[PDB]
Every structure is written in C-alpha cells, then in structure tokens.
C-alpha cells in the first residue's frame, strides 16, 4: 500500500497527456501552485530553500524526541555531528536517505539561524515570484541578475534586473558566515 494526496482528479479511462516537467515552471500535477491542504482550504505550494528546509526537519525531529521521551516516561561540523545524533534517536536508521539529506542541508545551507531565514523569507516573499523561483533564489548563490536569470530561467521576464540585483545584494548581506 502506497501514499495518497489531496489532489482528487477523476481520470476515467483517459490515460495521458502527462506533459514533461521543467523550468517553464511546469512541475507535476501534484506540484501545482493551487495545492489543497487537508483541512479543506486551498493553500499555495510550499517550496523550501536548503536551510529553510534544514530548520524544518531539525525542528520536527527535535519535537519528535520530546514526544518520544514523553511516551518513554510512562558550529557547522559540530552542528553535523549533533544532527547525526538527533537522527540516531528519532529516525529509523534504515532511512539513509534522511542522514544523506541532513548532511547535504547542513553543509550547503546558506542561512544558519531562524532569525536570518525569517528575514530571507520576508525579502523574497514580496517579489510575487513563484514558490519554486523563491526557493531556488534562496538556495542558489548568485551575484549577477544574469547568473540568477540563467540558473532560474523561469524569472527571465518576471522581474527587473536591477530589482533582482537589489535582492541578490541583500541576500549576500543576510548570508551567515562559517
């Protein structure tokens, strides 16, 4: 038995077209902007930037330890060793996929703290750009608006080069050290 969604589409006999996924911001039928949360409400898609992502998983796994020890009642490389330890408690271990992902996130995260990631999220979530672009813009380190408009082609006409460059300059500022 596998995983179901919230996207209902009654596909009677009519199999295909399934039109290829791209950076024509044509993601899956599942990865549509107008996605629908279970409480009935239609909520916009959630794409995370590596770090906005890391902070979620960390938090979720930390809260899990809390609940696991509630039922059991009755510095980068130092951040990496500690994560492998939090995982050792809350995860299945057989889930090498998460450990692999956790190391990746820990290494490649651009913004260390929730305070920082907050400000990052504010800045980009005002551009009117599509969830994907916003996430890619948050996790890809670009200097020229061209670097960005080349790596994120979906942007190509959506924003002023100067305005995009203003954002890029303010991302470089928020960028935490190592």
């Amino acid at each position: 038995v596998s995983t179901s969604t919230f996207q209902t589409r009654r596909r009677r006999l009519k199999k295909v077209e399934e039109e290829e996924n791209a950076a024509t911001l044509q993601l899956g039928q599942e990865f549509q902007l107008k996605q629908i949360n279970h409480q009935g409400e239609e909520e916009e898609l959630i794409a995370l930037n590596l770090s906005e992502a890391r902070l979620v998983i960390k938090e979720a796994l930390v809260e899990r330890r809390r609940a696991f020890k509630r039922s059991q009642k009755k510095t980068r490389e130092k951040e990496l060793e500690s994560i492998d330890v939090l995982l050792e408690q809350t995860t299945g271990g057989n889930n090498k996929d998460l450990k692999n992902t956790m190391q990746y996130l820990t290494n490649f995260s651009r913004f260390r703290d929730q305070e920082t990631v907050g400000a990052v999220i504010q800045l980009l979530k005002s551009t009117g750009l599509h969830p994907f672009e916003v996430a890619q813009l948050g996790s890809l380190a670009c200097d020229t608006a061209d670097e960005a408009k080349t790596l994120i082609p979906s942007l190509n006409n959506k924003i002023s080069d100067d305005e995009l460059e203003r954002i890029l300059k303010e991302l470089s500022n928020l960028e935490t050290l190592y």
Binding site: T5, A23, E30, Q35, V56, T101, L105
Partner: protein, 171 residues
C-alpha cells in the same frame, strides 16, 4: 524545490494492536512505511512533520477479517528533482565516462560529453579526476549541475545533468 506536501496513507492494523497504545503503533507504523521511502509521484518522502498532531481518524473494521483500516492523514518534507532544476552538489564517483554528484538524497550523473571540452579525464590520480585549463574536479569536489532529465526508479530517482552551460560547473 524541497517541498512540504500534505499526504495520506492507508494502514491496516491487526486486532491484537487494539490496545491504548493505538495511536502510538499506528504513528510508528506510518513512520516506518513513509519515511525514507521514495515514489515517482512525490519523490523522496524524507521526514514526517508534526508527530504530535498526526491525524489518525476513525478506522473502519474490515468485514470478514478483524483488522481495521485508518486513513492516516499527514504532512511531510519531500524532494522531487526536475529537468531544468539547477542544483549545488558534491562529487561521489568519477569514471572515464563522467562524475556522479550527490545532491541531497539523490545522485545526478554528469557525462564526459555533458562537460566543457577543456575538461579531460585524468586516470593517473588518487582518486581519478577531470582536469581543465585551470580547474580540477575529483572525488571530494563541490559542483553546480543543471538537471537535464530524470529516471524515476524503484526506491530512488536518478538524473543526468550538465556543467556545459554558463554559471555551471565547480564552485
């Protein structure tokens, strides 16, 4: 990318588990079945969110057998890569054919022919490398690859990527 997608999963508990550690065994069974898993549809279902508020709902008792079926509703952090997706990754392996790069849970492989011409395969090194007019890509190196296309397969998703285009390559 790296999305948060609301999802559900049907679990058929056996009558022996109809004790008060009900929600517990179900939430745990859900975590076993879903976390670390990978489908094509939603990609890598990496980590289940908000354990404390995982919705069990009522479970219908299946008729000629005793077992009950609950549609566990839940939210999770997923990873589906796409064609055109530009990803920052670390090199893993490196053959005369190209270099496979670890990007999160998945491996994106770069063909010798998807790389700029100047980059040549150097066999004579520990470990084997790719040498440019000024650049060097080997095992531990960090890269930026554009995903050219994906192959949804079993309990993974693998993909072919390029470092030919502008702003792509080593970092």
């Amino acid at each position: 990318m790296f999305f948060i997608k609301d999802l559900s999963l049907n679990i058929t508990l056996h009558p022996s588990f109809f004790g008060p550690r009900m929600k517990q065994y179900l939430k745990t069974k859900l975590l076993e079945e879903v976390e670390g898993s990978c489908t094509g549809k939603f990609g890598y279902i990496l980590c289940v969110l908000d354990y404390d508020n995982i919705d069990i709902q009522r479970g219908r008792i299946l008729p000629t057998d005793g077992s009950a079926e609950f549609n566990v509703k839940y939210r999770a952090v997923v990873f589906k890569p796409f064609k055109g997706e530009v990803v920052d990754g670390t090199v893993v392996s490196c053959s005369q054919h190209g270099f496979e790069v670890q990007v999160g849970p998945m491996k994106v492989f770069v063909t010798k022919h998807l790389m700029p011409q100047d980059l040549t395969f150097n066999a004579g090194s520990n470990p084997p490398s790719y040498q440019s007019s000024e650049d060097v890509i080997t095992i531990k190196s960090r890269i930026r690859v554009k995903i050219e296309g994906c192959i949804s397969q079993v309990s993974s998703i693998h993909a072919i990527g390029s470092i030919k285009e502008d702003y792509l390559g080593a970092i």
